[PDB]
Design a binder for this molecule. Structure first.
Ligand code: NAP
Ligand code: MTX
Length: 157
């Protein structure tokens, strides 16, 4: 299976100045639960903003840089390489990879952040006419998670 994994706000903002505009620990645990034991594919800027590979799963970075070699990271240089990765593969970001892959993935795990943040990078527009809602779960709010959010699993019709 080839899936998108993304958190975007009410206007589809995903990032600002190579960081996330929000901090939402529940969403990072969502990422950890979905992706532990599988594969993440991310663009070079997304990788550099995380700084290190995420533990207990395969980290694949797409870059044109043939000098890229990071301990604990597999490197690919073409979109077509993604289709050779075995197992459950999550397209992890950022804007460039989401734009390149949204028409190719089987399904999307989207966290809708119910706020309007300042952004400079966006998830591409999509319509529910193309996507069935396999599940929709409101995130629980607490002291450490103060922004309303919803976990959507969307499957291509
Ligand atoms: N909210 C979320 O769910 C989420 C998730 C992830 C990231 N983000 C945010 O998204 C933003 C980054 O997005 P972005 O679009 O600027 O960057 P990005 O997609 O993370 O990385 C772009 C880079 O990926 C490489 N790349 C992409 N397509 C390629 C291809 N077809 N062939 C070879 N290399 C390719 C290139 O690297 P080279 O230039 O090295 O060749 C390109 O410069 C940040 O703000 C980050 O915080 C948000
Ligand atoms: C900046 N970044 C990219 C990022 C952030 N939120 C997302 N949220 C969703 N839904 N999808 C993504 N693609 C996504 N990507 C990050 C930053 C930190 C960690 C991280 O430390 N995750 C730990 C969990 C951290 C924790 O337990 O609090 C993990 O094991 O995956 C993940 C991605």
């Amino acid at each position: 299976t080839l899936s998108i994994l993304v958190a975007h706000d009410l206007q589809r903002v995903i990032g600002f100045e190579n960081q996330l505009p929000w901090h939402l620990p529940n969403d990072l645990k969502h990422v950890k639960k979905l992706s532990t034991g599988h594969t993440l594919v991310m663009g070079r800027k997304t990788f550099e903003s995380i700084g290190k590979p995420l533990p207990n799963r395969r980290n694949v970075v797409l870059t044109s840089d043939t000098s890229f070699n990071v301990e604990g990271v597999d490197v690919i240089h073409s979109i077509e390489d993604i289709y050779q990765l075995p197992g459950h593969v999550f397209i992890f970001g950022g804007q460039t990879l989401f734009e390149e892959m949204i028409d190719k993935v089987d399904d999307m795990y989207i966290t809708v952040i119910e706020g309007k943040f300042r952004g400079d990078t966006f998830f591409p527009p999509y319509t529910f006419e193309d996507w069935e809602v396999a599940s929709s779960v409101e995130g629980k709010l607490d002291e450490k998670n103060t922004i309303p959010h919803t976990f959507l699993h969307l499957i291509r019709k």
